[PDB]
């Protein structure tokens, strides 16, 4: 610590610099170290490290803010706005305290969007773009409840890079970013489905596999932030994601359409998810893109065991055979691991007739395989 403070003293002094990238590094530097700083903090949560924490974010935001709406070099500007993502994803709750902060980043924020700052081609389309990955950090960062007001007018904004007849990456990235901002917004995203189910609905019907997955993972994300507005559509929405299944080739939308059902069936309350459904669904699985998904499938697992298990019992066949071809896989959670062979000790345990003609047309040593560990 008495080494970083010298280092935050002496790399501020780069921005009384005249040279453009000097300034850059500089705010780029400050911002990781920011961010090493609280990864530091969180190791041994000293509670002058906390202060010093704070009292470093106190001067490199407000330097960030200064930066955008004077700096007349946009470049500058532009790492200004990675770094400040940065720091709204690392530090989050600990750079909106100071009452007001989060109002003020909302307003540099909407200044970069419509280009209403002092530093205001290809620099355009990437300030924009910036400025536009800082909403769901921030979202995050403040806890929706206090940023929704906020969303309220980025939403249209950010739907503009959506309408028919922009680029795949505008299209794709705003959209993607629009996901990322439901879940940041958390409950306080029942405010908007109804404005964004249009968005995700046709953005699904598009041609390039990135913008379908962004937009059926935005649907899913929806469906389980969305709450009671969102519940209203859940027949809707199973509806377009029933037929893809079968009807999509492309694996990342596969996999992202099965954690979008994942979080439809886990979201929906009432009775239990309907036999088609997670037929598919686990037809579907194992993934093979997105991988992130797995922890979703893992807690859909879980769900089963909770809510209905006179259900699991006639997936079996699909649920040991994911299992036998995804414990040689060490790249899948262990979490993920442990809740499907829940469903599996159940089976065998509690249902030992369709545990058996389920290991039936595994092969036999992946049958023996499942046996080693399971009794």
Request: hydrophobic letters at 45%.
């Given at each position: 610590?008495?080494?970083?403070?010298?280092?935050?003293?002496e790399v501020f002094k780069l921005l009384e610099c005249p040279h453009l990238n000097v300034r850059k590094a500089a705010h780029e530097a400050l911002?990781?170290?920011?961010?090493?700083?609280?990864?530091?903090?969180?190791?041994?949560?000293?509670?002058?490290?906390?202060?010093?924490?704070?009292?470093?974010?106190?001067?490199?935001?407000?330097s960030?803010?200064?930066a955008?709406?004077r700096e007349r070099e946009r470049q500058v500007v532009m790492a200004v706005?990675?770094a400040?993502?940065?720091?709204?994803?690392?530090?989050?709750?600990?750079?909106?305290?100071?009452?007001?902060?989060?109002?003020?980043?909302?307003?540099?924020?909407?200044?970069?969007?419509?280009?209403?700052?002092?530093c205001?081609?290809?620099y355009?389309?990437?300030?924009?773009?910036?400025?536009?990955?800082?909403?769901?950090?921030?979202?995050?960062?403040?806890?929706?409840?206090?940023?929704?007001?906020?969303?309220?007018?980025?939403?249209?904004?950010?739907?503009?890079?959506?309408?028919?007849?922009?680029?795949?990456?505008?299209?794709?990235?705003?959209?993607?970013?629009?996901?990322?901002?439901?879940?940041?917004?958390?409950?306080?995203?029942?405010?908007?489905?109804?404005?964004?189910?249009?968005?995700?609905?046709?953005?699904?019907?598009?041609?390039?596999?990135?913008?379908?997955?962004?937009?059926?993972?935005?649907?899913?994300?929806?469906?389980?932030?969305?709450?009671?507005?969102?519940?209203?559509?859940?027949?809707?929405?199973?509806?377009?994601?029933?037929?893809?299944?079968?009807?999509?080739?492309?694996?990342?939308?596969?996999?992202?359409?099965?954690?979008?059902?994942?979080?439809?069936?886990?979201?929906?309350?009432?009775?239990?998810?309907?036999?088609?459904?997670?037929?598919?669904?686990?037809?579907?699985?194992?993934?093979?893109?997105?991988?992130?998904?797995?922890?979703?499938?893992?807690?859909?697992?879980?769900?089963?065991?909770?809510?209905?298990?006179?259900?699991?019992?006639?997936?079996?066949?699909?649920?040991?055979?994911?299992?036998?071809?995804?414990?040689?896989?060490?790249?899948?959670?262990?979490?993920?691991?442990?809740?499907?062979?829940?469903?599996?000790?159940?089976?065998?345990?509690?249902?030992?007739?369709?545990?058996?003609?389920?290991?039936?047309?595994?092969?036999?040593?992946?049958?023996?395989?499942?046996?080693?560990?399971?009794?």
């Amino acid at each position: 610590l008495p080494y970083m403070e010298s280092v935050f003293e002496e790399v501020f002094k780069l921005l009384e610099c005249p040279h453009l990238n000097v300034r850059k590094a500089a705010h780029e530097a400050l911002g990781q170290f920011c961010c090493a700083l609280h990864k530091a903090c969180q190791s041994c949560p000293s509670e002058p490290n906390t202060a010093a924490l704070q009292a470093a974010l106190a001067r490199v935001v407000p330097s960030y803010m200064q930066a955008v709406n004077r700096e007349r070099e946009r470049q500058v500007v532009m790492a200004v706005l990675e770094a400040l993502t940065g720091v709204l994803r690392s530090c989050g709750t600990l750079t909106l305290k100071p009452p007001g902060r989060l109002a003020e980043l909302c307003g540099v924020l909407k200044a970069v969007l419509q280009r209403k700052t002092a530093c205001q081609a290809e620099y355009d389309a990437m300030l924009l773009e910036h400025a536009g990955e800082a909403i769901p950090a921030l979202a995050a960062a403040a806890g929706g409840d206090s940023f929704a007001p906020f969303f309220a007018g980025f939403l249209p904004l950010l739907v503009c890079k959506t309408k028919q007849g922009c680029t795949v990456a505008e299209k794709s990235f705003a959209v993607g970013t629009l996901a990322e901002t439901i879940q940041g917004l958390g409950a306080a995203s029942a405010q908007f489905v109804s404005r964004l189910l249009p968005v995700l609905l046709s953005t699904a019907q598009e041609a390039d596999p990135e913008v379908r997955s962004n937009a059926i993972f935005g649907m899913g994300v929806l469906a389980e932030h969305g709450g009671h507005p969102a519940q209203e559509h859940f027949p809707k929405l199973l509806g377009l994601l029933f037929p893809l299944l079968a009807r999509e080739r492309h694996d990342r939308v596969r996999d992202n359409i099965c954690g979008a059902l994942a979080r439809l069936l886990m979201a929906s309350p009432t009775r239990k998810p309907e036999p088609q459904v997670l037929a598919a669904l686990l037809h579907a699985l194992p993934l093979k893109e997105d991988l992130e998904e797995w922890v979703t499938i893992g807690r859909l697992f879980s769900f089963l065991y909770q809510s209905s298990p006179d259900q699991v019992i006639d997936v079996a066949p699909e649920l040991l055979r994911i299992c036998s071809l995804i414990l040689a896989d060490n790249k899948i959670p262990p979490d993920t691991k442990a809740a499907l062979l829940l469903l599996l000790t159940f089976l065998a345990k509690q249902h030992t007739d369709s545990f058996q003609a389920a290991l039936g047309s595994l092969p036999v040593d992946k049958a023996q395989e499942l046996q080693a560990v399971l009794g």
